[PDB]
Design a protein around this ligand. Structure first.
Ligand code: NAP
Ligand code: EII
Ligand code: NA
Length: 163
């Protein structure tokens, strides 16, 4: 089955300036816990956004979606479409689409689960910000309690499944 996983500010921002515009260690831990041992599918800009020690994401099968036919991505599998990414030669019990905004929009109709971290950080969207998908009435969810990060931000985790 196919899930999306993302972290967003309350305003809906997921990315800015080729990175993530807040620091939330508990979300990094949540992301690793859900994805370790499994397949992670990402757009090429997200692959390029990964910090050095996380490119590729260790312990996960990294799959990068690009239109660049000749692209080499050391440590990842390069495919030419989201459908290809979700049609592996070797099946995985759990495939996670891990961003970014362009790929989330393509994957949402193919997914049955979304794992969302909401971050209470004031970020009025800027024009080039990458934004989260919005889940419509075909999705229903459950919300964890609001927690405080050791680094100061309030955050909570939501779990949605297709109705
Ligand atoms: N949870 C989070 O907070 C989270 C998670 C992930 C990323 N981010 C952030 O999000 C931003 C990146 O997101 P983004 O939306 O700009 O980019 P993205 O979705 O990661 O990557 C876009 C790229 O995917 C490829 N692509 C898109 N549609 C395609 C299609 N139909 N077929 C083949 N390839 C296709 C293209 O690669 P080519 O140009 O190579 O052809 C395109 O440039 C960064 O700021 C990153 O830090 C945040
Ligand atoms: N909930 C949720 N969903 C996502 N798709 C997601 O982006 C995952 C793609 C970006 O990876 C980053 C970014 C920067 C630093 C480290 C990593 C990976 C760490 C690892 O796993 O080796 C995230 C990240 C948000 C920023 C902090 C790390 C996790 N969080
Ligand atoms: Na690895």
């Amino acid at each position: 089955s196919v899930g999306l996983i993302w972290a967003q500010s309350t305003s809906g921002v997921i990315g800015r300036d080729g990175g993530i515009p807040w620091r939330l260690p508990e979300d990094l831990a949540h992301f690793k816990r859900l994805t370790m041992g499994h397949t992670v599918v990402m757009g090429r800009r997200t692959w390029d956004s990964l910090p050095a020690a996380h490119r590729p994401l260790p312990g996960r099968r990294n799959v990068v979606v690009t239109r660049q036919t000749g692209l080499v991505a050391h440590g990842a599998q390069v495919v030419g479409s989201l459908e290809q990414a979700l049609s592996p030669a070797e099946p995985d019990a759990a495939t996670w689409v891990i961003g970014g905004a362009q790929i989330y929009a393509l994957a949402l109709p193919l997914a049955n689960r979304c794992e969302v971290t909401e971050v209470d950080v004031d970020l009025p969207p800027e024009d080039e910000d990458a934004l989260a998908p919005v889940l419509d009435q075909t999705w229903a969810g459950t919300s964890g309690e609001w927690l405080v990060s050791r680094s100061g931000l309030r955050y909570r985790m939501h779990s949605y499944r297709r109705l």
